[PDB]
Amino acid sequence: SCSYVVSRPVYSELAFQQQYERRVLKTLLPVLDWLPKYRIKEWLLSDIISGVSTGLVGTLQGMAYALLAAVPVGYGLYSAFFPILTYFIFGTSRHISVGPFPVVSLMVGSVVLSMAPDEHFIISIDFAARDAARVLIASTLTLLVGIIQLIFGGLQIGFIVRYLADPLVGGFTTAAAFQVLVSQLKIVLNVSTKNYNGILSIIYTLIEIFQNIGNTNLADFIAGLLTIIICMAVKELNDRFKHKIPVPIPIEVIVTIIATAISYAVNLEKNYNAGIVKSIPRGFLPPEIPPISLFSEMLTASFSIAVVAYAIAVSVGKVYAIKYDYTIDGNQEFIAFGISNIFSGFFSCFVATTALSRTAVQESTGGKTQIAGIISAAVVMIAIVALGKLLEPLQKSVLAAVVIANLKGMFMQVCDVPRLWRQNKTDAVIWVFTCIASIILGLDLGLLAGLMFGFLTVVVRVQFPSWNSLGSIPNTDIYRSTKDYKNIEEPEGVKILRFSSPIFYGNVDGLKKCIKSTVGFDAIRVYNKRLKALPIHSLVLDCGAVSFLDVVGVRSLRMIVKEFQRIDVHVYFASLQDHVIEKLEQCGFFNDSIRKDIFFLTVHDAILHLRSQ
Amino acid sequence: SCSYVVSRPVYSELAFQQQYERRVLKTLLPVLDWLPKYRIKEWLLSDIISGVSTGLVGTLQGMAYALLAAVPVGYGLYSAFFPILTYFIFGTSRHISVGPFPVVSLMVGSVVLSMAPDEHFIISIDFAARDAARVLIASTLTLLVGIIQLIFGGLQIGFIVRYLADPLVGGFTTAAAFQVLVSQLKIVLNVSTKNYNGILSIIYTLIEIFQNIGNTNLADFIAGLLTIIICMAVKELNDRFKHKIPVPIPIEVIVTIIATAISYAVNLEKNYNAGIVKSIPRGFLPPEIPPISLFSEMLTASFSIAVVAYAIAVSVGKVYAIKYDYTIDGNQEFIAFGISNIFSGFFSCFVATTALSRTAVQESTGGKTQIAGIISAAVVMIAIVALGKLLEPLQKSVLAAVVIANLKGMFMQVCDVPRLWRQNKTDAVIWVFTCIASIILGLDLGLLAGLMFGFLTVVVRVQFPSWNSLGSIPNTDIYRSTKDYKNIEEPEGVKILRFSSPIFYGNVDGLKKCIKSTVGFDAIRVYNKRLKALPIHSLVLDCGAVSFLDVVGVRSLRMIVKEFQRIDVHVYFASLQDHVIEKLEQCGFFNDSIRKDIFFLTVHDAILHLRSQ
Ligand SMILES: CCCCCCCCCCC(CCCCCCCCCC)(CO[C@@H]1O[C@H](CO)[C@@H](O[C@H]2O[C@H](CO)[C@@H](O)[C@H](O)[C@H]2O)[C@H](O)[C@H]1O)CO[C@@H]1O[C@H](CO)[C@@H](O[C@H]2O[C@H](CO)[C@@H](O)[C@H](O)[C@H]2O)[C@H](O)[C@H]1O
Ligand SMILES: CCCCCCCCCCC(CCCCCCCCCC)(CO[C@@H]1O[C@H](CO)[C@@H](O[C@H]2O[C@H](CO)[C@@H](O)[C@H](O)[C@H]2O)[C@H](O)[C@H]1O)CO[C@@H]1O[C@H](CO)[C@@H](O[C@H]2O[C@H](CO)[C@@H](O)[C@H](O)[C@H]2O)[C@H](O)[C@H]1O
Ligand SMILES: CCCCCCCCCCO[C@@H]1O[C@H](CO)[C@@H](O[C@H]2O[C@H](CO)[C@@H](O)[C@H](O)[C@H]2O)[C@H](O)[C@H]1O
Ligand SMILES: CCCCCCCCCCO[C@@H]1O[C@H](CO)[C@@H](O[C@H]2O[C@H](CO)[C@@H](O)[C@H](O)[C@H]2O)[C@H](O)[C@H]1O
Ligand SMILES: CC(C)CCC[C@@H](C)[C@H]1CC[C@H]2[C@@H]3CC=C4C[C@@H](O)CC[C@]4(C)[C@H]3CC[C@]12C
Ligand SMILES: CC(C)CCC[C@@H](C)[C@H]1CC[C@H]2[C@@H]3CC=C4C[C@@H](O)CC[C@]4(C)[C@H]3CC[C@]12C
Ligand SMILES: CC(C)CCC[C@@H](C)[C@H]1CC[C@H]2[C@@H]3CC=C4C[C@@H](O)CC[C@]4(C)[C@H]3CC[C@]12C
Ligand SMILES: CC(C)CCC[C@@H](C)[C@H]1CC[C@H]2[C@@H]3CC=C4C[C@@H](O)CC[C@]4(C)[C@H]3CC[C@]12C
Ligand SMILES: CC(C)CCC[C@@H](C)[C@H]1CC[C@H]2[C@@H]3CC=C4C[C@@H](O)CC[C@]4(C)[C@H]3CC[C@]12C
Ligand SMILES: CC(C)CCC[C@@H](C)[C@H]1CC[C@H]2[C@@H]3CC=C4C[C@@H](O)CC[C@]4(C)[C@H]3CC[C@]12C
Ligand SMILES: CC(C)CCC[C@@H](C)[C@H]1CC[C@H]2[C@@H]3CC=C4C[C@@H](O)CC[C@]4(C)[C@H]3CC[C@]12C
Ligand SMILES: CC(C)CCC[C@@H](C)[C@H]1CC[C@H]2[C@@H]3CC=C4C[C@@H](O)CC[C@]4(C)[C@H]3CC[C@]12C
Ligand SMILES: [Cl-]
Ligand SMILES: [Cl-]
Ligand SMILES: [Cl-]
Ligand SMILES: [Cl-]
């Protein structure tokens, strides 16, 4: 077959350089971008059906996730309504449904509970004033999140969600599922547990829940259990029996309607003391300017909430964009969601993002442009102004049960943890650390810890790389580690060291130790011994994988070269990239008799050059 | 001359694997290690002189740095005495002088002031009780630092000081010099400034200092200014006139002696209301167990103090070890300094490390084994029990002036910042960020911010690497970027992409964008267009610099291969290391018709294999 034949001079870097010479309408993405391009002839019907279905789903989801946040039911309707309108303009995606997404809602509720506890606020009971304070804190956090998102959009730094690695995303998702389960289990049992704010909050909440389980409400617990069983069974049947009924069954909506009708018919509120929403405001409240003074106490939480909400939004947007063959602008997603969160925070809402289930409902029911979003917003509006009184007898345990039933996919990544461990130990470590940190910390603090742990794992992987003592495969130009192939011959009086990482301070110390181990000695000790009195003659450094190089690395390279030259040992560098050589030359490496003539193209010109002497 | 000639088959990874087959008395380092090995015949005289000189220096330095800490003068004597004895046993180094090192002292004093303010403690004035509380807090912090250091010694994690990069070390050093200058300027002016704890503390301290400058004491200011001028002038003359007097002149000791004698003679305390130490305890106080309850409020500070103190200790130890041709055990340095800090914290001392100036004094005066340290400790002892009354009239402004005069070398790295910027922009950015963060934050918080900023810079450098579209140098096996050499020929219908970094999630997105830019299109869009209807035929991925690889990277590689195979474009991988291929095979890469036959040794076997078809 084909053979590897090449005839050329031995080029050093100096010789190679000598012979081969070197050397305005998108920030506000208009609705006019697609409204004139709209397809009125047929798209209206699909948009209307999809919007009605996803609005029916989104009213329920906003009401349910308003319990995850520490705000009364009814403001979830606002959080489902306002962000859709203020995303219809700036939004790039045309399939995602904008709403609470109970993970962001639970982080918001954790912030609100930390900044407005029951005992800290009410010292008399002042339900109305406490609810007003909780709503105001939620609106302030939403406005801060929107400001952060808009700032990130202005700076065009949309690559930050790259840092949200899949292992840490999965660990954070499982931990958030655990937190949501704990909160909604507190809700369904109708047990009054004092809210623990800080570290080990979830564990203390569980301890108090199982302590006060004796005070559980039978009606609320039974309703929640029955709702969970019905929803999960219907979802399982739909997953199995999937060839028919292409649209997913809106089991949650029907379950909530039946529960509300039954609770209105037999009046669980007064007969069994059931926990119902008991209050939904009618009409739209006037806007209020959030107090910016609280911004200092929400920074570490607003940053994490903005990052998580945007990551979920673009995740769902990209999942549906690769399906419908279009691209979503990430920086414009910053802009759209930041403006949306600011607008919603002014109008008394909590942080807005998209939900995978709601987006799936919207798309599977004839998903088309964001007009379906507008129809969903109109449905939420008519629920706000007309259907507010009808949903009063509905139990909060039903909404919590709906959320718990939806938590299954988020609970299932414990199954993929072991295969992650088998595939790559550091990824499983990232997963487990993110999960545990998000459990015994805040969810925001857990996210920040997971991000910095991912950064630390990258730093450790580049700091302790693979390094090999290379010898030649006979009659070829293939150099491989002498301990791996058993047919590798060691050349005459020269050691070849491949350091498979960029050289920086941690890699400085690692590379010094690796050279000392490879050559079997160190230059300083032998030089001092020879001075007091008064095996290897060359070391080739295979730097093919050296990506970058800093001033500490350049200093280390100069020190290594000088120390080995002191004991008549020549150090040659091979396979260095052009930019690394430029870094060397601008860092002052080529001074004091270096002259770039000890740099070869690969680790075979070095050996040939040695054999010439 | 020598020519590059090689004849071999074209090996893929599969073919290459087919033909070439693969596959108890040191933790307590005894004084008995060198006491029997001691050289009594001649080493006693050198040890005695060096110990007396360095003890005379260390008494003054401990007294001066006790002002950097928020403890009364006299406990610096204990901090200079006890750690030396408890380091004489476990210490590896035999040249460093154990003591306060005013940077660690200032961080300790910042912690103590934050945990014991004047207004928070004294509400009546209770100088004695406030001093006792400050001393107890300092001892608690010292014990916590020693516990952390001993734990780090048990875990053998001595590579952590590698993360203290030279740029961030320099920035932190300059910021610490600024903080020390501010504190000692507050001391010399004898102006009562309320202590600002937290962020922008140094700026507020300066504002109040220049506001209250009208209350300055003329005698203290003049004494401090004269001491500074004398010390700096003598140091400059010694640096210039250096051929004679090999031992550095102990100008600080003579200056302090003269100042104390003058203040005793003419009684500045009552005549000019000068700020003198006014109190030094006689004898050794009994030990007290620090209250562990405060450990929760010192963790982020104790960690940074331990890291900084150990880093300084091993820095000086290595500087003198490479001079005297010996090696110091870093993990045993953890053990020794942790035991020393625990012992000192029990006996009412603040955190102990080494000082470069004191170590230079000890070594230059006949530096020998740690017996000189014991002699210095004895000198400090006789100062504690006898010379305590003699040093009472000494002004604290003199000690602050001594520290300010010594601050020059720490202030001089602003000169090396611009050359750092010229050499490597990221290193200068690390320097400036560390300096600014340590300025507008705590010094401990500044150190932590600098550490995680260095980690972030490493992550960013590996996340946005150099990537090149490679073409062949004619009649050779040299492939270089087509835009750099102007003699590079692009092969027939194939693009070669070198991605000079390990592939991870950030690098996943970067590499996808790089491939899309190089080939001039993306696989998904063209595949979808062809499906709706119903330039490049190969892409070689030069992965020579790919160091590691994670599950996200493996998934990305599989997705890229499948997407390009969908449009009849073959993707070949070349120059991959053996461990990266092992990572691929254990991550499930070689499934669904991959079979390792698309992996070549270098980017010349790929081109030859293409030319075979
Ligand atoms: C882009 C990259 C990421 C950016 C991240 C940005 C984080 C910003 C943090 C901001 C910060 C530190 C600033 C310095 C941080 C240095 C870190 C160095 C790190 C080095 C790598 C501000 O610190 C000070 O906090 C004061 C309050 O304590 C605040 O209020 C004071 O003045 C007011 C008038 O101005 C006056 O009205 C008010 O009365 C005063 O008190 C001050 O204004 C403010 O300066 C800390 O505050 C954050 O908020 C909470 C405070 O309690 C705290 O909440 C947590 O509570 C749960 C437990 O209970 C926990 O479980 C939750 O999680 C979380 O809800 C957060 O934890 C904390 O973080
Ligand atoms: C190896 C790797 C590194 C390890 C680093 C270890 C850091 C440990 C920090 C510990 C910590 C956070 C824990 C969670 C951190 C999560 C981080 C996530 C990061 C994600 C990227 C504990 O948080 C809680 O703090 C409470 C006090 O507030 C403390 O006391 C409570 O219970 C007691 C009875 O137990 C009871 O007696 C007490 O009355 C209670 O109040 C609790 O016990 C404790 O749990 C924060 O505490 C640290 O100490 C100070 C507190 O004020 C604070 O001091 C600063 O003040 C200056 C300004 O004034 C500032 O300028 C200085 O710098 C610094 O002096 C620190 O800043 C803070 O850090
Ligand atoms: C890019 C890097 C970003 C790093 C961001 C770091 C954010 C942390 C700042 C300070 O840390 C928090 O401070 C709170 C101050 O209140 C603590 O609450 C505490 O407040 C109570 C009262 O002090 C304590 O008793 C409780 O332990 C606890 O809830 C909380 O635990 C602690 O985490
Ligand atoms: C490897 C990752 C390591 C992460 C380490 C994170 C350490 C920070 C934890 C909490 O942060 C601190 O909390 C203090 C709580 O007291 C704040 O003091 C504050 O206390 C006063 C009272 O609340 C405020 O008014 C002042 O702004 C300020 O001094 C201080 O500013 C803030 O930094
Ligand atoms: C389809 C789903 C949503 C219907 C939910 C309706 C709810 C309100 C119904 C369904 C099951 C019912 C419970 C069934 C049995 C009992 C025991 C009886 O001694 C008191 C009433 C009580 C506790 C009922 C309360 C109301 C209840 C919880
Ligand atoms: C509310 C409290 C109780 C939640 C506690 C959650 C913790 C304990 C759980 C959540 C996910 C779990 C991990 C999921 C999967 C695996 C792989 C298998 O080899 C068992 C261990 C390991 C690594 C688990 C360890 C325990 C774990 C981290
Ligand atoms: C070890 C390997 C072979 C297990 C393979 C099956 C995996 C997917 C299953 C089997 C049993 C499961 C564990 C059973 C019980 C618990 C406790 C609870 O906290 C949930 C997670 C955890 C820890 C599960 C994680 C996933 C798990 C480990
Ligand atoms: C990858 C890096 C960034 C992770 C850093 C995590 C660190 C800062 C966190 C993780 C868990 C935290 C601990 C959790 C619980 C407690 C108990 C409390 O009474 C004092 C604080 C203390 C002791 C915390 C100190 C800080 C801590 C150790
Ligand atoms: C060698 C060094 C350390 C000697 C220091 C001695 C100190 C105590 C001496 C040196 C210079 C002296 C000052 C010189 C001039 C004056 C002005 C006079 O109207 C009041 C006394 C006053 C303010 C003196 C106070 C004491 C003083 C500050
Ligand atoms: C107490 C307060 C006033 C201290 C403030 C210190 C700050 C402002 C100082 C300390 C060191 C300084 C840097 C030192 C050196 C250089 C290089 C030169 O190109 C000027 C800018 C730059 C980058 C300086 C910027 C300002 C700087 C960061
Ligand atoms: C820009 C290049 C050419 C300067 C070369 C000379 C360097 C070493 C000198 C010249 C002038 C110096 C600056 C003069 C003034 C200040 C303000 C103060 O905060 C100290 C640092 C700083 C910022 C100095 C840093 C170092 C400096 C920039
Ligand atoms: C490289 C990474 C780890 C560095 C992270 C540094 C971050 C966490 C620090 C650096 C400077 C800090 C800010 C300094 C000053 C203030 C003003 C105060 O009123 C509120 C907090 C606030 C706004 C701080 C928030 C946190 C902050 C932005
Ligand atoms: Cl979902
Ligand atoms: Cl849900
Ligand atoms: Cl020094
Ligand atoms: Cl000094």
Numbering used by the authors:
A (entry chain C), B (entry chain D): 17 to 39, 64 to 164, 176 to 585, 654 to 732
The authors write:
The structures of ssPendrin in the presence of I−, HCO3− or Cl− were determined by cryo-electron microscopy (cryo-EM) to an overall resolution of 2.8 Å, 2.7 Å, and 2.5 Å, respectively. Since the three structures have only minor differences, we describe the Cl−-bound ssPendrin here. The final structural model includes residues 17 to 39, 64 to 585, and 654 to 732, which resolves all 14 transmembrane helices and their connecting loops and most of the STAS domain. TM3 and TM10 cross roughly in the center of the membrane, and together with residues from TM1 and TM8, form a cradle for substrate anions. The anion in S1 is coordinated by the backbone hydrogens of Leu407 and Ser408 and the side chain hydroxyl hydrogen of Ser408. The side of the aromatic ring of Phe141 from TM3 is within 4.0 Å of S1 and could stabilize the anion in S1 by anion-π interactions. The anion at the S2 position is coordinated by the sidechain hydroxyl hydrogen of Tyr105 and sidechain amide hydrogens of Gln101 and Asn457. While the anion in S1 is coordinated within the transport domain, the anion of S2 involves residue Asn457, which is on TM12 from the scaffold domain. In all three ssPendrin structures, the anion binding sites are solvent accessible from the intracellular side through a large cavity formed between the transport and scaffold domains. Thus, the structures of ssPendrin are captured in the inward-facing conformation.
Pendrin (SLC26A4) is an anion exchanger that mediates bicarbonate (HCO3−) exchange for chloride (Cl−) and is crucial for maintaining pH and salt homeostasis in the kidney, lung, and cochlea. Pendrin also exports iodide (I−) in the thyroid gland. Pendrin mutations in humans lead to Pendred syndrome, causing hearing loss and goiter. Here, we present structures of pendrin from Sus scrofa (ssPendrin), which is 90% identical to human pendrin, in complex with either I−, HCO3−, or Cl−; ssPendrin in the apo-state; and ssPendrin in the presence of NFA, which inhibits anion transport.
